[PDB]
Design a protein around this nucleic acid. Structure first.
Lengths: 69, 88, 264, 119, 101
RNA sequence: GUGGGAGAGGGUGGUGGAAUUCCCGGAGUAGCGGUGAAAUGCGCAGAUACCGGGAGGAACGCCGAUGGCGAAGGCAGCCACCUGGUCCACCCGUGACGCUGAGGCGCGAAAGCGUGGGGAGCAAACCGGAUUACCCGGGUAGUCCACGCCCUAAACGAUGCGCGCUAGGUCUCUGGGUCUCCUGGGGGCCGAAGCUAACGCGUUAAGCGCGCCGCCUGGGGAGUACGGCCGCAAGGC
């Protein structure tokens, strides 16, 4: 199930819509590929830009630790 | 950048007749303005090699347009060169 | 077993190049299989074989029945003193030669250290690679020039006696083999204050070859590291040496430079 | 000695060796164990069996300090991560969570000759 | 005279006094550098995914301004001098490009 | 010209985190590290695991693409400024103002070099170890910056540029419209006619044509010798 599917209506250039932004990051603080997100490249590119910008703001994690062996 | 204001002002200044946006004089004027801006930019930014190619092409275009203008009508050529102070 | 030469023709030619006669004496280094030893002993007054290989010696030793001049000494030439050999085994023939067809990774340091050992012998003829042969026998302003040429210039004037095809060697080396001759000079080629200091200088000059003599001597020299601030007078002490390199200069130039260095 | 009653066990699982360190929440290392302290040398230092023995040894020598529960984070990509974790959890200390915190560069320093040629 | 958005994150470990003085001084600088604020969004405290300046907490403040383009760098360098502010990031105002309309 | 679009195109300042290496502490016991297996090496002056604080340099993990930009060489964190190229739409202005281009001028990966800075990591040369009678431990220039040289490559699509005509199918990037689809531009894979010694190319031609330029005339000798020009030199034409 693509991450896009389990979502409604939002804006991508909004680098403060933090709650939706946690969705597009994996179990680790990594940006999910197009296979998981379910967007077009343009959307993926702009989303990655926004994600990095938010990371700079400290609203999002650069990296995390995964609860698994 | 060259905002709409001064661009339109130059177009109005150098137009042969009202509603002329593409004549030789207008083209030469716009190219001259762009050349001036890029020249000063490259003066400040010496090691911007990529922009220098653009400058060369713009200068070439202006030279070709001036050549045609001189060929077809020399009086307009002299008037334009004195107006814009090209070639010195 | 390394690449072993199997040609009687080129072996005869090389042993001729060695001038192995009745009067001539032979030092054998790494007798190995015993083809070179075969071609040497029959025309040599006394052959002294040095080797440290475990079993390459006593097997060959069996074949040494017809030869009466085969005084094989089992030891490493580098580790073991050779001074005593001159007195003990050259009573038959005072003339000295060293002949080798060994691998070069062992041969070249052996030759260097033997020359360092300061044993006065007439000459040496060894088998080496084309590139290293060019390196030793080199002229000024060459890509094949370096510190090795400078080192060998004191001892001998060299020339590759006979270029060797790769075919003769069992496994074939990719690069051509070229046998050189090293016949010891009467004494030092050019005088110097200190030999060790001379060597340090030549190392410093050719450390970063491409850079200017000045840039080499600034950073390479340890005493240069000490007198970095003082290199001004070092520039002053230079005579007719402008913006220059190492390769540009010759033996006499470097000798005069060293003699000047002592006066700093 | 300390009796924190709740610490954390670090598992440094390299290719050549596995290291297990148990420590308090304050990061103060109470003790440690490795494949080397068991007696294994050379190649067999990083074997999964060595990881098992190291985990058990660390657990045993930690029980003396009264440790009962730990929260483990594993480091390195060595062959014996799974073996070490299973041995540790089956030693007598109730692990709360199992986590990895393997350090990965963000294309920083230039690696060794062998570890180069990254896709 | 382009429209920019201005972001300031500053020390949460400040009472009303330091907060107010910082706000007024940064507004002073804003109006100093030829800027003209329209609207202000106040976000109070938010948890950070990683600690900045040894602090896991941060105070947020948001502006969107239309101001001279040549002076935005000057404003950014000015606002960053104080030790009470951690990150200052000035970005150009972007149109809401919607998704899956 | 007007109204829009995408982009690691370039230059200048600012600063975000993860590593790596050192320094300062707290705790910590006997190894750590390394290999096909080992040795060198570090560690009782308390190493390696690990917690915190600080310094410094270099490079930007996922996104990431068989993707995009550029005339090539090349270009990946983020922010802002100054700029280069390009696509579509309206058909609005001009009237052939165009193509190519001997010399000239400029750009030109990496490695070198001069004059000054910087040096975390890697690492020519070099110091060690060892075995299969390459590989592991250290380390200099160099890789980093400013200015000035050098002008070389499997600098390759081994395919010069511009324009016109000649079936389509499929996957992508980016626009526009009346939006199952039409219409442009860019990048791949099959394949009509056709071409080729063959492999193969095929609307991004190596097809059918036109214009201009640059080269080829058996293999070595030889990119050598002499002469000339350009560089501090190595060297380049």
């Amino acid at each position: 199930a693509k991450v896009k599917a389990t979502l409604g209506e939002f804006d991508l250039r909004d680098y403060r819509n933090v709650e939706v932004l946690k969705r597009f990051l994996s179990e680790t603080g990594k940006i999910l590929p197009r296979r998981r997100t379910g967007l077009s490249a343009k959307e993926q590119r702009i989303l990655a830009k926004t994600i990095k910008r938010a990371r700079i703001l400290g609203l999002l994690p650069f990296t995390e630790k995964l609860v698994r062996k | 950048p060259i905002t709409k204001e001064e661009k339109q002002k130059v177009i109005q200044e150098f137009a042969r007749f009202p509603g002329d946006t593409g004549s030789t004089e207008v083209q030469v004027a716009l190219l001259t303005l762009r050349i001036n801006r890029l020249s000063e930019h490259l003066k400040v930014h010496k090691k911007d090699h990529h922009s220098h190619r653009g400058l060369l092409m713009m200068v070439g275009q202006r030279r070709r347009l001036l050549r045609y203008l001189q060929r077809e009508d020399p009086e307009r050529y002299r008037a334009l060169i004195e107006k814009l102070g090209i070639r010195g | 077993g390394q690449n072993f030469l199997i040609d009687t023709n080129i072996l005869n030619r090389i042993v001729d190049h060695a001038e192995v006669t009745e009067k001539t004496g032979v030092i054998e280094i790494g007798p190995g299989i015993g083809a070179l030893t075969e071609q040497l002993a029959k025309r040599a007054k006394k052959v002294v074989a040095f080797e440290i290989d475990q079993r390459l010696l006593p097997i060959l030793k069996d074949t040494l029945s017809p030869y009466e001049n085969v005084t094989v000494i089992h030891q490493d030439v580098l580790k073991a003193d050779v001074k005593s050999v001159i007195e003990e085994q050259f009573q038959d023939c005072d003339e000295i030669m060293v002949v080798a067809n060994l691998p070069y990774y062992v041969t070249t340091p052996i030759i260097m250290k033997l020359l360092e050992e300061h044993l006065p012998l007439k000459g040496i003829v060894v088998m080496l690679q084309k590139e290293v042969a060019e390196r030793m026998a080199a002229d000024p302003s060459s890509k094949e020039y370096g510190s090795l040429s400078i080192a060998v210039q004191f001892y001998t004037e060299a020339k590759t006696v006979m270029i060797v095809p790769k075919t003769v060697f069992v496994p074939q080396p990719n690069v051509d083999s070229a046998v050189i001759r090293l016949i010891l000079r009467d004494g030092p080629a050019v005088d110097v204050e200190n030999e060790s200091f001379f060597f340090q200088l030549i190392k410093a000059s050719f450390a970063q070859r491409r850079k200017t003599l000045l840039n080499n001597l600034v950073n390479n020299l340890p005493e240069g590291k000490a007198q970095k601030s003082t290199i001004e007078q070092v520039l002053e002490e230079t005579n007719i040496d402008g913006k220059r390199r190492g390769e540009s200069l010759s033996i006499e130039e470097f000798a005069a430079l060293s003699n000047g260095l002592y006066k700093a | 000695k300390r009796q924190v009653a709740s610490g954390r066990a670090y598992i440094h699982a390299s290719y050549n060796n596995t290291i297990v360190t148990i420590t308090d929440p304050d990061g103060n290392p109470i003790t440690w164990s490795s494949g080397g302290v068991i007696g294994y040398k050379g190649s067999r230092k990083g074997t999964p069996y060595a990881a098992q023995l190291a985990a058990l040894d660390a657990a045993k020598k930690a029980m003396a300090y009264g440790m009962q529960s730990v929260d483990v984070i594993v480091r390195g990509t060595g062959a014996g991560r799974e073996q070490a974790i299973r041995a540790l959890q089956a030693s007598g200390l109730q692990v709360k969570s199992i986590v990895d915190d393997t350090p990965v560069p963000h294309n920083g320093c230039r690696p060794k000759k062998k570890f180069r040629k990254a896709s | 005279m382009r429209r920019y958005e201005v972001n300031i994150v500053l020390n949460p470990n400040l009472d009303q006094s330091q907060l107010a003085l910082e706000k007024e001084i940064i507004q002073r600088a804003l109006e100093n550098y030829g800027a003209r604020v329209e609207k202000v969004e106040e976000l109070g405290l938010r948890r950070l995914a990683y600690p900045i300046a040894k602090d896991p907490q941060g105070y947020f403040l948001w502006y969107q301004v239309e101001m001279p383009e040549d002076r935005v760098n000057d404003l950014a360098r000015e606002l960053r001098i104080r030790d009470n502010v951690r990150r200052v990031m000035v970005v150009k105002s972007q149109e809401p490009f919607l998704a899956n309309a």
